[PDB]
Symmetry: C3
């Protein structure tokens, strides 16, 4: 039967990893997105930011694909993002997908914007 898709745009802080905003396209109670972990490399030149998305839709199985980009007021810093953890499989109800990003150290104030492309069905 029923099939649904949603796009959720998450703004997170590049220094603490904290989530600043969860912005739903067309869904707020259907998913829970949370910081799992934010660790510096011992060099301090990179940052590892790890997030989880939990399917909270009773009845539904979900797929999740992602895109992420650094949002910054400067233009001189490296903004490549390395993908680490990435759950490409089905995500049952109350199961989580984990999405990890390796980012270069950013200037103060820089943000990580993560786009979750959700495809769910019963």
């Amino acid at each position: 039967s029923d099939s649904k898709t949603a796009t959720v745009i998450v703004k997170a802080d590049c220094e603490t990893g904290d989530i600043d905003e969860v912005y739903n396209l067309a869904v707020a109670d259907s998913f829970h997105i949370y910081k799992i972990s934010a660790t510096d490399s011992d060099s301090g030149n990179t940052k590892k930011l790890l997030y989880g998305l939990r399917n909270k839709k009773a009845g539904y199985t979900c797929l999740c694909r992602i895109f992420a980009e650094i949002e910054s007021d400067g233009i001189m810093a490296n903004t490549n993002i390395g993908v680490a953890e990435n759950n490409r499989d089905e995500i049952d109800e109350n199961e989580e997908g984990k999405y990890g990003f390796l980012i270069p150290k950013q200037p103060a104030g820089a943000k990580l914007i993560i786009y979750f492309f959700l495809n769910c069905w019963t």
Copy 2:
């Protein structure tokens, strides 16, 4: 009551700032997008491109989130984009949100593609 979302993909010229195309996903009369300003830095190494989006939907209040990327036939130029003006707040009817981008000088022909993620309600 009613709630709506739209994605609008705008192609603008990196040298003049002029808008080449307003491409609506699922909306053409609901919004007006326009160049406000295009200024070189006195160094001439960067470009400041500023756009406005006006809510034209009678009854509706809107949120707007953005993504932008340089579209270019080369691969050797810096394509980092610095975010400047960015209206994250509610946008009432006939109110505008202003979105400003700091870009590096690009080779001839390069374009700025701006994605507007619109979430409107009554």
Copy 3:
């Protein structure tokens, strides 16, 4: 009469060009996406990856806009993408749009993620 939009996220391999996954947002039989060509530059420092999208929707004419990004577990490589072939025009039934990308040589395992923004009508 009727009007429709779809987003299709394609994962392709940066070394062979092969398509790993066609991920439809809200469509699987409406379009066919295929590798046309993958060629090294004789320098071997760049890669030219060319794809076709065929409209398979009986009755429909389509527009297609694209976004592409390198998905990689590292952060040290150039990930600029040069746009080459790009069909901006109408695409009739069983007509194809061709989309070509110039990418820098990537580390093993790196992927090209192409986003097709489809707007179709009768």
